[PDB]
Amino acid sequence: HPSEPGVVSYAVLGKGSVGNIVGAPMGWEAVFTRPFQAFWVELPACNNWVDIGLPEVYDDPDLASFNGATTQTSATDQTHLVKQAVGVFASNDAADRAFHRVVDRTVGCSGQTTAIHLDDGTTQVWSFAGGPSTGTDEAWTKQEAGTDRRCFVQTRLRENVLLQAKVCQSGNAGPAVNVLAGAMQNTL
Amino acid sequence: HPSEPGVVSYAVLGKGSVGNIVGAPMGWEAVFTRPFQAFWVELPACNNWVDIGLPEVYDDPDLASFNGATTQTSATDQTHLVKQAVGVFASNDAADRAFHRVVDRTVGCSGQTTAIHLDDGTTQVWSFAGGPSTGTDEAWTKQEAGTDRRCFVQTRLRENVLLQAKVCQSGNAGPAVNVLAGAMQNTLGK
Amino acid sequence: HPSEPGVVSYAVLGKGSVGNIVGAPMGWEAVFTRPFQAFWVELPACNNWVDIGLPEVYDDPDLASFNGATTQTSATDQTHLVKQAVGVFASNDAADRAFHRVVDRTVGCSGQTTAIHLDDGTTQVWSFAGGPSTGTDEAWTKQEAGTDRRCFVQTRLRENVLLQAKVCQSGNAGPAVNVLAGAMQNTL
Amino acid sequence: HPSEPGVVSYAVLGKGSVGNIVGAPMGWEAVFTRPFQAFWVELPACNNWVDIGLPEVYDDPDLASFNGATTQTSATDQTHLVKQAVGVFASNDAADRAFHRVVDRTVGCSGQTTAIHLDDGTTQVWSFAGGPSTGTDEAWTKQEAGTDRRCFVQTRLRENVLLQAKVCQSGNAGPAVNVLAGAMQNTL
Amino acid sequence: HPSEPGVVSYAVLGKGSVGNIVGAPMGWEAVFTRPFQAFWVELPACNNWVDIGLPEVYDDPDLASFNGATTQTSATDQTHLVKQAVGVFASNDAADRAFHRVVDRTVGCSGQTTAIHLDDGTTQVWSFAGGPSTGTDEAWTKQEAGTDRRCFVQTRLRENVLLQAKVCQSGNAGPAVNVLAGAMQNTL
Amino acid sequence: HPSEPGVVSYAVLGKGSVGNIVGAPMGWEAVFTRPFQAFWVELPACNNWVDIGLPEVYDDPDLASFNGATTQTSATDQTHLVKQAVGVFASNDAADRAFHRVVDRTVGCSGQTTAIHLDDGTTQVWSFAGGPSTGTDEAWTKQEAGTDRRCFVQTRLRENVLLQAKVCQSGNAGPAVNVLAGAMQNTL
Amino acid sequence: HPSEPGVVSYAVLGKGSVGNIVGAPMGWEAVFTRPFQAFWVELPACNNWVDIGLPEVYDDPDLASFNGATTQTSATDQTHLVKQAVGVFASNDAADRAFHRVVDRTVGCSGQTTAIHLDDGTTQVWSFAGGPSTGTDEAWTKQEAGTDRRCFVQTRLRENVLLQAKVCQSGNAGPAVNVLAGAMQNTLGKL
């Protein structure tokens, strides 16, 4: 149905629940109520794969409500970095267009490596690739160059809602992000 | 069935409930037990579309009870501004007249822009536009000039009750206000 | 059935319940356990329509129990003024006579305006107007001359019980006093 | 079936319950565990109608248990004065004899006025009048001369238990004492 | 069935329960875990009727457990004096012998008056009188010479248990001791 | 089903439950998690009958878990002294051998008197006497010389569990220890 | 049904539960969120039998989540020492390879005795001995040379989860480790 705008406040899981999905302690979280982009990427086709909850994707006249949260192991530690973003739109078409602003504008990014200049002044190099995608689903993976750290991301279009879930950690975040995305979707 | 005068105290939702409807934190609220107008508008036709719970609309010898509340993000923040007003009338006709005091007096306001002078001293310019309206429902949307901020409002005439729900925020407050209006209406069965 | 004397203590609703009936905050109440008249009226026919719980009406050798309470918005605020009085009589006849001390002695008060001299020294002017009255019910409404303030009053004779309910406010207290009178009656 | 001695401690109702029966506040009570007489009457036939819980009535070799309580509006207020007395006897005959010590010894007290000299030194004049009396029930009313104050009393013989209930107040205590006597009898 | 040794701790009722049985306030109690005799009697046949929980009766190689408690109105007040004693024996025969140390040794005590010299130095005269006695029950009543104060006692042999209940008061403790003995027996 | 190692922590009853089995106050206890011997005996055949929870009996490479507790009236009172020991073994045979380390090594001890030198420096003389013993049960009773004090003990082999229960008191601890043993066994 | 990564946080039992399994007081515990090896062994074939939750066994690009905890009688007492390690893998194969990294690399450790040099500086000598092992189970027992102290260990492969449970004490920890391994396995029925 037209998921009521109130779902965004429940669809973003707390640090406690995030911890019991990734299977590790998560002591620090920061809730963001407005879409932000705290970077710029050299290869501009990868922009909408770098991070989730981006103005470019979510900012729209028909955006009813938006809520997200960045979760970490501690304030100082990034062993696990999880991010969630949920936007409710007035119409299904408004959400469908926001979903396609991710899939259409990230053609060519798959299999490329580019630099990402953060607002704090730092620079990082990430290798983007893969991502099994249907009409309503778009996944992808970004690997930090010169480490075994990988971020698995899922973007789900469910009627008038656009879910985005990101899980960063060594090994394989694939199973974790899929559970997190599904856990968020259940609140709708 | 007509609602009893008591429903007004339950029909106005708290800041917690309002927060869960809009989908954002709402820390500040202020309950008003008497209809009030804290502004004057340049184009006077738009008067009864500028705000809700107005004495012009609700003050009547057949007003049995009235209750409302303004809710905000914080005391110093208006990212979300929600307002509610519920009035119970002695008769269905008394309420129907109070409803028509909104629809009749706001003809021509649709599609216009006007400045609004607030009691605190500030001035804001809002572009109005009429929404869907049946015999027992009147919805309109007002947009602040220069910004992406919009207030969606719903006025509902339910037997001997007149509901009013306003939700102000960037993007589309259309779904949010409809949930709030419906949530207020459900308590009339109590 | 005949009501037991004990109902008077339950039949007079507290400020919390009175508030929920009128639909406004009621912070101040004062219980009175004895019929009392703290005024005299110029047109003496209006006496028993000025106020409720009057010695003239209730005081009788067959008065078993009596209770009442005046309720206000605050101690210093009269936006809403509610008053209740309940009296249980030894016989149905004794109560029926007490009821007829309200209807018979208030002939010629309907449609009149008279001054009311309060014990505290103040004087007020109220215009009286008789309402619907059956054999077991007597409703009247009094309006303070030069204001939109009106008091709707209901007097109900239920077997051996005499209920009196008053609700004073701007607008229309007609619905509110009917809910109050009914709520007081349900306790019997 | 014949009540156990333990009932006396439950058959005497507290000030809270007594207040709810008379329909007025009762803030002061005083439990007495032994029958006493704190007076003497001029016309000696009226002795056992003056008060309840009297040694003359209850004192018996077959008295199993006894309990009573005087209840008032407050310590300094006698608007309502309620008294209860319950005695359990070893045999039904012991209780029946104790019942007949009230009915037989108060012949020629009905319709008389007499003075009652209290232990504290005071004197009061009361006018007695017999009420409805079966084989197991004896009711009577005493009225204080020169006031509207009347005391309705009920003595009930139930199996091996003798109940006594007194309610003193202006107006009619008749309904109130019958409720009290009935409420006391239920606990058996 | 033969009771377990543990019943003694539940079979002795607290002052609260004893108060509800006699139907009067009981504020003071003292639990004794060992049989004692704090007196000697002139006519020595009456020894085992003077008191309960006596070493002469209960002290046996086959005594598994024992518990008792003396209860009073207060530390200073003896209006009601109640005493309980419960002994569990290894075999039914041991308990039966203990019961017969009460019935056999108290032949010729019935209808006699004798002095009783207490440990504290005081002396008291009591008139004894045997009550109904089957094979498993032995009831007797003792009266303090001069006063209307009587103690009704019951001794009950229930399998491998020996109960003793005493209730002292003016009037008739007969009903009260039977309820107590019955209440103690139910805990088995 | 062969009892899990965990049972030992629940099979040992606390001072509250021990008090309700012996039917007397038990204020002091001390839990021991390791088999100990805090004495030596002159006639060394009686070693495994002197006390329970002995290293000689329980210590074994197939001992899975062990728990026990000594309970007394108070820290300075031994009117009642209760002791419990529970050992779970890896196999039924390991427990069966540990059971026979009691029955085999105590031949000739029955009907003998011997002195027991305690670790605290005291000496006590006890007379031993064997009781009923099947293939899975071994009961004995030791009597402190020159007193009526006796300790009834029960060793029970239940599958892969070896229970030991001791109750010390004047009179007969026989019924008390059989209840305690059974109470410990039910937790398996 | 491949167990979700989250199970690791519930599959590692607390000191209270562990105390009820071994049947003795367990006052001290320390949770470890990452596989770690705080020792080196002289005979290197015994490496993956010395301890549990070892990087060599668990560390893999398909390791989804890992959690474990060491439990003791007290901070200063080791009468009972219990260790648990649970790792969830992205596939059943990734977990099956991690299981075989224990069974394949500990051939010729059975019946041997070797010294073990701990990071804190201490040394301990342990006599190892292989136990019953199926395709999805690998049990072994190690005994501290010169004491009656023995550690029974179970390694269980359950779909995409690798369980490891160690119970150390005098007498026989065989029953206790089977209860603990079983208790940890029951929590894998949780979504």
Any chain F CB within 8 A of the CB of E93? no
Can you tell me whether residue C172 is helix, strand or coil?
Answer: coil
Q: Are A24 and G7 a contacting pair at CB < 8 A?
A: no
Is the alpha carbon torsion for E168, E174, E175, E180 positive or negative?
A: positive
Beta bridge partners of residue C85, listed in sequence order: C68, C164
Find chain B residues with C-beta within 8 A of C19's C-beta.
9
Q: Are G61 and A25 a contacting pair at CB < 8 A?
A: no
Does residue A16 fall inside a structural domain?
yes
Name the strand (E) or helix (H) holding E8. helix E8-11
Q: Alpha-carbon distance E171 to B17, whole Å?
A: 69
F174-186 helix and F15-22 helix, angle to the nearest 10 degrees: 140
Q: Which of F110, F111, F113, F112 is nearest to F145 (CA)?
A: F113
Can you tell me whether residue G114 is helix, strand or coil?
Answer: strand
CB of E70 closer than 8 Å to CB of E21? no
Does residue B66 fall inside a structural domain?
yes
In Å, what is the CA distance from E28 to each residue of D34, E159, G8? 19, 32, 60
**How many C-beta atoms surround the C-beta of residue A136 within 10 A?**
12
Find chain G residues with C-beta within 8 A of F90's C-beta.
171-172, 174-175
Burial tier of C118 (Cβ tally within 10 Å: 0-12, 13-18, 19+): exposed
Q: What is the 3-state secondary structure (H, E, C) of F132-153?
A: EECCCEEEEEEEECCCCCEEEE
Q: What is the DSSP letter of D109?
A: -
Burial tier of F154 (Cβ tally within 10 Å: 0-12, 13-18, 19+): buried
Q: Are C174 and B60 a contacting pair at CB < 8 A?
A: no
CB of C90 closer than 8 Å to CB of C64? yes
Start-to-end CA distance of chain F, whole Å, equals: 9
Q: Alpha-carbon distance D70 to A135, whole Å?
A: 85
Tokens of E51: 């008191």
Residue of D nearest to C7 (CA): D23
The closest CB to that of G88, out of A19, A23, A148, belongs to: A23
Amino acid, single-letter form, for residue B69 = A
Place of tokens 């929600």: B82
Q: What was the elucidation method?
A: X-ray
Q: Are F9 and G24 a contacting pair at CB < 8 A?
A: yes
Does residue C1 fall inside a structural domain?
no
Q: Which chains touch D (3 or more CB pairs under 8 A)?
A: C, E
Place of tokens 């056999």: E104
Q: Are F90 and G23 a contacting pair at CB < 8 A?
A: no
Does residue F77 fall inside a structural domain?
yes
Q: Alpha-carbon distance B161 to E80, whole Å?
A: 69
Torsion over CA of G96, G98, G99 and G101, rounded to 10 degrees? 130
- With touching defined as 3 or more inter-chain CB pairs under 8 Å, the answer for chains E and C is no
Q: Alpha-carbon distance G48 to G44, whole Å?
A: 9
Q: Where are the beta strands (DSSP E) in D19-103?
A: 28-32, 39-41, 63-72, 81-89
Any chain B CB within 8 A of the CB of C172? yes
Q: Residue D93: CB partners within 8 Å, gap ≥ 6?
A: none
Q: Alpha-carbon distance C131 to C111, whole Å?
A: 11
Q: Are A64 and B179 a contacting pair at CB < 8 A?
A: no
Does residue G1 fall inside a structural domain?
no
Q: What is the DSSP letter of G7?
A: G
Q: Which residues numbered 111-140 in F keep a CB inside 8 Å of some CB on G?
A: none
The closest CB to that of G172, out of F7, F9, F90, belongs to: F90
Counted across chains B and C, CB pairs separated by less than 8 A come out at 56
Q: Alpha-carbon distance G96 to G85, whole Å?
A: 16
Q: Alpha-carbon distance F138 to F68, whole Å?
A: 18
Q: Which of C69, C92, C82, C94 is nearest to C154 (CA)?
A: C82
Beta bridge partners of residue G116, listed in sequence order: G41, G124
Residue of D nearest to E173 (CA): D64
Beta bridge partners of residue B182, listed in sequence order: none
Phi, psi of E185 (to 5 degrees): -65, -35
What is the residue range of G171's domain?
7-187
Q: Are D9 and E24 a contacting pair at CB < 8 A?
A: yes
Q: Are C6 and D23 a contacting pair at CB < 8 A?
A: yes
Q: Alpha-carbon distance F41 to F31, whole Å?
A: 24
Place of tokens 């002197």: F50
Does residue G2 fall inside a structural domain?
no
CB of A70 closer than 8 Å to CB of A29? yes
In Å, what is the CA distance from C188 to each residue of C1, C91, C173, C182, C185? 9, 16, 23, 10, 6
Find chain G residues with C-beta within 8 A of A19's C-beta.
9
Does residue B1 fall inside a structural domain?
no
- With touching defined as 3 or more inter-chain CB pairs under 8 Å, the answer for chains D and F is no
Any chain A CB within 8 A of the CB of B180? no
* Domains held by chain E: number: 1
The closest CB to that of D176, out of C5, C60, C89, belongs to: C5
* ∠ Cα A51 A54 A57 (to 5°): 115
CB of D153 closer than 8 Å to CB of D177? yes
Q: Alpha-carbon distance F147 to F143, whole Å?
A: 8
Question: How many angstroms separate the CA of residue G65 from the nearest CA in chain F?
Answer: 30
CB of E151 closer than 8 Å to CB of E142? yes
- Helix ranges (H only) for F27-91 are 47-50, 55-58
Residue B36: which CATH number? 3.40.1000.70
Q: Alpha-carbon distance A64 to A61, whole Å?
A: 8
Tokens of B37: 């107008």
Does residue B167 fall inside a structural domain?
yes
Residue of E nearest to D32 (CA): E24
Q: Where are the beta strands (DSSP E) in F10-98?
A: 28-32, 39-41, 63-72, 81-89
Any chain A CB within 8 A of the CB of G157? no
**How many C-beta atoms surround the C-beta of residue G3 within 10 A?**
24
Q: Alpha-carbon distance C39 to C126, whole Å?
A: 13
Any chain A CB within 8 A of the CB of G170? no
Is the alpha carbon torsion for F90, F91, F92, F96 positive or negative?
A: negative
* ∠ Cα C179 C185 C187 (to 5°): 115
Q: Alpha-carbon distance B150 to B141, whole Å?
A: 7
Q: Which of G32, G10, G9, G90 is nearest to A177 (CA)?
A: G90
Q: Alpha-carbon distance A123 to F40, whole Å?
A: 78
The closest CB to that of F61, out of G22, G148, G179, belongs to: G148
